[PDB]
Every structure is written in C-alpha cells, then in structure tokens.
C-alpha cells in the first residue's frame, strides 16, 4: 500500500539537493557526531564536579518538594508536577538511535482511530472560518530573518547578506515557481529557483525528559522513547519495527573514557527539519502578517505575554481544562493542507503561491545521521511531491498550522460535549466565521486560550458549564477520546506556555494563579538545549547568545514559584558542596560580563549602559532565543533586541509581492 520511495546520497536526486559548494557537501555527508556540551563557558556537561552536583540537587529537591498536584490534574501548594530527576542526563550526548521520520501518517492517524477529513459539516465550515478569519485583512511587513539560520537546500548559507538576496528574489521568482508546480514541473521550479527538492532532518536535543527511582532498587528510570527503523518509516508502519532507543550511558566509559554516575542518562532526541529557504521566503511573507492579525484581532485567545496577562483571562472562568496532544506535528493532517489550501483559492488568493504553500507541506525529506553508520538517505521523490509526514517543524507557517488544527479541535470538543445549544448558530460559511470571530475574541460562554499543541479550554456561567465538568470527567476517567481529530488527554499539573496554574484548596480558576515553573527554571540552567558556542565570534549568530543576562529576568519569571528561595538556597548549598564556590557569585559575573558584551550589539547602549531599559522578556530570549519560537513572538520584544536577533527584507518590497499574491 505504497512504500516511499528512497535513494542514497549517491543518487543524482540526493545530489540535487546540494550546493557545489563546502557548506553544504559537509552537510549532505555530515556523519553521526557526539559529545559533551560547554554547558557554560570553560564547563563541560560532564565535568563530575557538574554531575556531583545535579546528582545531590536532584536528590534534595526531589526529596523535600514532592509533587502536589490532585486527582484532576490540578497542581496546588508548592508548586512542583513532578520530581527533578529529568536533570540528570549526559548533555550532548543522544540516546540511540535517533527515529527514521515516517513518509506517511495515514495509517497511523488510521489506527488510532482519527479521522480522514472532517466529520460533520459544521466542522467543514469551522476548519475553513478559521481559514477566512486568519488569511483576509492582511497588512503587508518586512520578512524578517533569524540571524544565523541556513537557507538549508540547496546552499546551506548562514549570511545574512546571501539571506536577503535569496529572499529577495524569492519573493520576485516565486510566481513563475508557483505556476510551473501547477503544470506538474517540479524539478524545473526546483532548478531554476530553488523552490522544492527536500526538508533536511536534523536531530535536536530534548535535554531533560522523564526519570524515575524505583524504591524497591534504588536504581533510577529512564522513560523509554520509541523509534521508527527505515523499514517501518518508509512503509508508513505496514512493515519495519518500532521499538526503544537506548538511553543506557554505560558506553561512554568505555568509548571516550567519561565517568559516567549511577542514574545519568543519553538525551532524548528529537527530530527538526530545515526547509528550503526560498521556497519558505514566499511562505513567510504572507505567515507573519497572519500572526500579525491574530495577535492583534484575536489576542484574546492567541496573544499570551506574562504569567499576569494569562492570570487575567484565567480567572473570569468558572472551569478551566488544561489539554494534552499525542504527537501533534507528527498526526497533523494532510487533509488539512488540501482543506486550507481550497479555502485559500476560494478566498481568491493566488493560485500559484496557494501551489508553493501545498507543495510545502507534501515535500521529501532527506535523513541525515539517525545513528552511527546510518542516515544519509532522501526519503520521497522531489520530482513529483507526495509526502505525508504530519507538519514539518522548518515550513515557514507551522506555528499557523498547528494552531489553526488546534483551536479548531478543542472549540469542537466543548461544542461535541459541552455547547449543542450553540449549534444553530454554525448553520452556513457567514454565520460560522462571525460565530468564530466572537469565539475568537472570549465572548462566547466557551473559551479558550492556546498556541499550538498548548492550551487551556474555559468554560463561564451558563448552560455549557455543567457540560464542562462532565467533559473534565471523561478526560479524568480516560477511557474514550474526546475528539475525532487527535488523542486529547488533561495534562498532568495543568500548565500553560510555561506557567503553572496554582490552584488552592477551593480548586477554582478565580482564585487560581499563574506561577513560572521552577523546573523549567532548572532545565534552562542545568540542562541547556545547547552550548555556549564560545568558538563563534558574532553572539547574535549564536543558540545562546548572551547565557548570564537570564539571571537578571530570574526572580521576574520564576519569583512567584512557592519553593523560589528554597531552590535557590538549595542550588547555592549544593554548587558550593561540589565546587567551593558561591553559584550566585559565579551567576553575578556571568550576567555583568554578558551585560557589557550585549552593549556591543545595541546601537542604544552606551559602552556600559546597564539593563535599564529592557523587560525580563528582553533578558530571557536574549539569553534563549527559542523562547521566541514557542514561548513568545516577535512583538513581545523590545525594538532595539529585535535588531540584535533579527533582521528584516523591506516592506517595500513584500508590499509588492503581497500585492499579487492577496486577493483584490
Ligand atoms: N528550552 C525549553 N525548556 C522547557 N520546555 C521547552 C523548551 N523549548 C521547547 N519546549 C517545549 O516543551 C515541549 C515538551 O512538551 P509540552 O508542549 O507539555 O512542554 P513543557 O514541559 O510545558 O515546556 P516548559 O518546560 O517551557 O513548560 C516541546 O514540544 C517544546 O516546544
Ligand atoms: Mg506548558
């Protein structure tokens, strides 16, 4: 029932994908590669000084702040969902191996039971409301441009310089791409301009994942996380294996003489996909003014900034239900693309740039390094796009689409089991979209608050509320799935977008709170996603540019945790145990000497004007900018640390392109 197709590196199709120049030959043929990350500058992850360390404070926290979350899923007192094991893992160095991503979720979605298109017609009018609501008034914005991004496939470039030409031409060639996708040319549109070929799959560390100690043992756990083999990716799971990587870090003595601790395990691995930047150039210029517009319009449900913003909306409900998704990116739909992309022409977009937004999301993937002696294999046929692996991560409007599939899902869910009365009102495309622009904006006695997979679903006084409560019990007993599109659960310790919601002994939104989470905390600290880079010259470039400056945000993000001194205290306890040194101190230089190092890079700021002018917000992403693809966006910045992250194509020239792209 179909087998992907796949060709080795040595095939001419592989080779298309790759520039005749180093960068990008390098990457084609990058081999499996591990090894220990500068945690921060001059030390190493697996420093035993460092390992004692996580070893004594995962122990101490674990200890005195066990978890306090109820029967519902509702976390109270201290504030803590689970134990603090998750940091106790080799930082940079993966479990294996690393999952071949499937060519195609169908059977997949199939098997689990989700459904093929949608079900009924209201959600047909809801799914393309969202649609009509999202892509129409559009004000035209500069593309802006991540600092040290690759333009992936073909050049594998990281100037910004090259960046803005690409773009540049992206966005004046991509008509002419468009239409000749139409007449089926792909590899023509692919030749001529670099619009098509593949995703390339990079694996990213997930840092901290689930450990457990078993009291019988006093061996610690670690969850075990499921692998696709080739044969069960390119069969879509008809054939092949699934099976448990190994997390055991055992092999590290014996390969390159690291002593590894009793409980410290390989990272979890996840996979990320680079998309060719000039096909995501045309993507990007219309995605930005769509989060633009909800940002803005609906900010109610789509625009969440501090633990107090999200406090604000929270305590209005009367219920407020935390979901969970089952690999989202992975499950996400093709039958969505087509929905959105006939939605789209319906609308009067361009049918060429509606084809690169198809096309888009159908593309092949090339597999890079899974395991030692495994990879380098392009998986689908960049000759004739048909590819259904769910979202890819690097498409230039994921975040819109995850979020578009989303809300729709959960507003469907309260409809299903909470809100029949309001039904009558989704009766025609007019009626659902003026529905769905008053849900949108939290008047309805339904709400939500979410990004993506994240959210929080609302109910108010009325008739849904008892509804509500019995849909909260379904989600508690965990025996059917409340929605036809995707596995939904309740999180455990309900939080959102990295704010706890603290409840008290009346187990009620109104007089619940918003609290950073002091894990998130230590995971941020302890178990950085990256190293310092210190090798590269321009911080901007960097994954983290300026580490320190997050110890200036701390108590402005993390202040209201109940356990806040405690850990704190105990992290100083435990440093000065495994080093002589006082953390604070160490933490105090870092950020003085991150401060001064910033002002290099702020045409605002003097020789050493001090983080006067900028919000924790400021602090925390220039510290992470990551936070800035799943925590914030772009507006919540500052505009003088916008400049140092990112840097933008004119509007003049996007204003033109948007222009012929937008209907009338
Ligand atoms: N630097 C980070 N620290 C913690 N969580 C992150 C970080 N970066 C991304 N995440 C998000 O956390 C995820 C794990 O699943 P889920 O969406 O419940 O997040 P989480 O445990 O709520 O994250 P957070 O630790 O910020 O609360 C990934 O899907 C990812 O987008
Ligand atoms: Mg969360």
């Given at each position: 029932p179909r087998r992907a197709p796949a060709f080795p590196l040595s095939d001419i199709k592989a080779q298309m994908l790759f520039a005749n120049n180093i960068k990008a030959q390098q990457a084609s043929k990058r081999s499996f590669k591990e090894g220990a990350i500068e945690t921060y500058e001059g030390l190493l992850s697996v420093d035993?000084?460092?390992?004692?360390?996580?070893?004594?404070?995962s122990r101490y926290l674990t200890d005195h702040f066990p978890a306090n979350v109820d029967e519902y899923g509702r976390v109270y007192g201290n504030g803590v969902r689970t134990n603090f094991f998750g940091m106790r893992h080799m930082n940079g160095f993966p479990m294996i191996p690393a999952t071949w991503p499937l060519a195609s979720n169908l059977k997949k979605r199939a098997d689990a039971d989700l459904a093929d298109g949608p079900v009924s017609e209201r959600d047909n009018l809801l799914f393309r409301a969202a649609v009509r609501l999202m892509f129409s008034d559009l004000e035209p914005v500069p593309l802006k441009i991540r600092k040290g991004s690759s333009t992936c496939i073909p050049y594998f470039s990281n100037d910004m310089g090259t960046k803005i030409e690409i773009a540049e031409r992206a966005l004046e060639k991509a008509e002419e791409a468009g239409n000749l996708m139409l007449q089926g040319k792909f590899d023509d549109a692919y030749q001529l301009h670099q619009m098509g070929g593949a995703y390339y799959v990079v694996?990213?560390?997930?840092?901290?994942?689930?450990?457990?100690?078993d009291p019988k043992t006093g061996k610690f756990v670690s969850k075990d996380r499921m692998v696709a083999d080739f044969e069960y990716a390119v069969t879509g799971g008809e054939q092949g294996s699934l099976f448990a990587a190994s997390k055991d870090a055992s092999r590290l003595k014996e390969q390159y003489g690291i002593d590894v601790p009793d409980g410290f395990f390989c990272e979890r691995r996840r996979t990320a996909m680079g998309g060719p930047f000039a096909l995501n150039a045309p993507i990007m210029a219309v995605a930005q003014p769509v989060r633009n517009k909800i940002y803005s319009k609906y900010a109610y449900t789509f625009h969440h900034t501090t633990r107090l913003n999200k406090e604000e909306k929270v305590k209005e409900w009367?219920?407020?239900?935390?979901?969970?998704?089952?690999?989202?990116?992975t499950f996400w739909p093709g039958w969505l693309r087509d929905l959105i992309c006939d939605e789209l022409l319906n609308m009067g977009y361009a049918p060429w740039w509606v084809k690169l937004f198809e096309t888009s999301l159908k593309l092949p993937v090339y597999v890079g390094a899974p395991a030692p002696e495994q990879g380098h294999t392009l998986l689908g046929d960049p000759s004739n796009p048909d590819l259904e692996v769910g979202l890819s991560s690097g498409q230039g409007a994921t975040d819109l689409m995850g979020t578009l599939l989303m809300s729709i899902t959960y507003l469907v869910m309260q409809l299903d089991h909470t809100a029949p009365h309001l039904n009558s009102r989704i009766k025609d495309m007019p009626s659902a979209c003026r529905f769905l622009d008053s849900y949108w904006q939290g008047h309805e006695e339904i709400r939500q608050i979410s990004k993506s997979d994240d959210a929080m679903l609302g109910w108010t006084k009325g008739r849904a509320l008892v509804g509500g409560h019995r849909l909260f019990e379904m989600l508690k007993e965990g025996k059917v799935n409340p929605s036809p599109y995707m596995k939904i659960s309740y999180e455990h310790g309900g939080a959102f977008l990295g704010d706890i919601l603290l409840y008290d002994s009346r187990r009620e939104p109104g007089s619940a709170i918003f609290v950073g989470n002091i894990n998130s905390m230590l995971n941020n600290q302890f178990s950085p996603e990256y190293g310092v880079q210190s090798g590269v010259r321009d911080r901007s470039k960097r994954k983290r540019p300026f580490p320190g400056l997050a110890w200036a945000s701390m108590k402005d993000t993390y202040g209201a945790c109940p356990i806040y001194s405690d850990v704190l205290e105990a992290i100083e306890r435990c440093w000065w145990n495994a080093f002589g040194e006082?953390?604070?101190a160490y933490r105090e230089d870092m950020l003085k000497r991150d401060t001064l190092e910033?002002?290099?890079?702020?045409?605002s700021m003097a020789r050493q004007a001090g983080l006067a002018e900028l919000t924790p917000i400021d602090l925390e992403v220039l510290a992470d900018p990551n936070k800035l693809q799943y925590k914030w966006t772009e507006a919540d910045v500052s505009a003088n640390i916008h400049e140092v992250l990112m840097h933008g194509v004119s509007v003049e020239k996007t204003e033109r392109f948007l222009r012929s792209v937008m209907p009338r």
């Amino acid at each position: 029932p179909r087998r992907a197709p796949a060709f080795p590196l040595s095939d001419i199709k592989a080779q298309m994908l790759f520039a005749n120049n180093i960068k990008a030959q390098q990457a084609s043929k990058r081999s499996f590669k591990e090894g220990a990350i500068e945690t921060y500058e001059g030390l190493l992850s697996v420093d035993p000084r460092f390992l004692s360390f996580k070893n004594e404070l995962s122990r101490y926290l674990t200890d005195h702040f066990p978890a306090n979350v109820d029967e519902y899923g509702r976390v109270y007192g201290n504030g803590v969902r689970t134990n603090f094991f998750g940091m106790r893992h080799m930082n940079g160095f993966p479990m294996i191996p690393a999952t071949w991503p499937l060519a195609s979720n169908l059977k997949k979605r199939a098997d689990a039971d989700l459904a093929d298109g949608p079900v009924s017609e209201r959600d047909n009018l809801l799914f393309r409301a969202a649609v009509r609501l999202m892509f129409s008034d559009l004000e035209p914005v500069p593309l802006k441009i991540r600092k040290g991004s690759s333009t992936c496939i073909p050049y594998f470039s990281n100037d910004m310089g090259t960046k803005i030409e690409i773009a540049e031409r992206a966005l004046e060639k991509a008509e002419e791409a468009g239409n000749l996708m139409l007449q089926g040319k792909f590899d023509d549109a692919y030749q001529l301009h670099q619009m098509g070929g593949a995703y390339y799959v990079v694996y990213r560390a997930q840092s901290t994942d689930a450990i457990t100690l078993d009291p019988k043992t006093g061996k610690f756990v670690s969850k075990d996380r499921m692998v696709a083999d080739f044969e069960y990716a390119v069969t879509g799971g008809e054939q092949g294996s699934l099976f448990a990587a190994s997390k055991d870090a055992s092999r590290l003595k014996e390969q390159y003489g690291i002593d590894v601790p009793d409980g410290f395990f390989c990272e979890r691995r996840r996979t990320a996909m680079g998309g060719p930047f000039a096909l995501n150039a045309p993507i990007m210029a219309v995605a930005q003014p769509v989060r633009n517009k909800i940002y803005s319009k609906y900010a109610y449900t789509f625009h969440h900034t501090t633990r107090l913003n999200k406090e604000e909306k929270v305590k209005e409900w009367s219920l407020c239900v935390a979901t969970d998704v089952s690999d989202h990116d992975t499950f996400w739909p093709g039958w969505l693309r087509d929905l959105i992309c006939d939605e789209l022409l319906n609308m009067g977009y361009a049918p060429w740039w509606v084809k690169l937004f198809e096309t888009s999301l159908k593309l092949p993937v090339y597999v890079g390094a899974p395991a030692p002696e495994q990879g380098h294999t392009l998986l689908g046929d960049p000759s004739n796009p048909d590819l259904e692996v769910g979202l890819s991560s690097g498409q230039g409007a994921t975040d819109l689409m995850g979020t578009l599939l989303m809300s729709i899902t959960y507003l469907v869910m309260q409809l299903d089991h909470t809100a029949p009365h309001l039904n009558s009102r989704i009766k025609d495309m007019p009626s659902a979209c003026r529905f769905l622009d008053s849900y949108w904006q939290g008047h309805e006695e339904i709400r939500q608050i979410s990004k993506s997979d994240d959210a929080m679903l609302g109910w108010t006084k009325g008739r849904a509320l008892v509804g509500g409560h019995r849909l909260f019990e379904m989600l508690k007993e965990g025996k059917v799935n409340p929605s036809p599109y995707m596995k939904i659960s309740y999180e455990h310790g309900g939080a959102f977008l990295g704010d706890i919601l603290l409840y008290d002994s009346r187990r009620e939104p109104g007089s619940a709170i918003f609290v950073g989470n002091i894990n998130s905390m230590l995971n941020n600290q302890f178990s950085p996603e990256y190293g310092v880079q210190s090798g590269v010259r321009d911080r901007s470039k960097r994954k983290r540019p300026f580490p320190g400056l997050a110890w200036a945000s701390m108590k402005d993000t993390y202040g209201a945790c109940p356990i806040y001194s405690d850990v704190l205290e105990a992290i100083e306890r435990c440093w000065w145990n495994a080093f002589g040194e006082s953390y604070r101190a160490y933490r105090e230089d870092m950020l003085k000497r991150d401060t001064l190092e910033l002002s290099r890079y702020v045409a605002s700021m003097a020789r050493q004007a001090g983080l006067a002018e900028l919000t924790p917000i400021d602090l925390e992403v220039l510290a992470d900018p990551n936070k800035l693809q799943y925590k914030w966006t772009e507006a919540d910045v500052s505009a003088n640390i916008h400049e140092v992250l990112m840097h933008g194509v004119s509007v003049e020239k996007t204003e033109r392109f948007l222009r012929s792209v937008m209907p009338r």
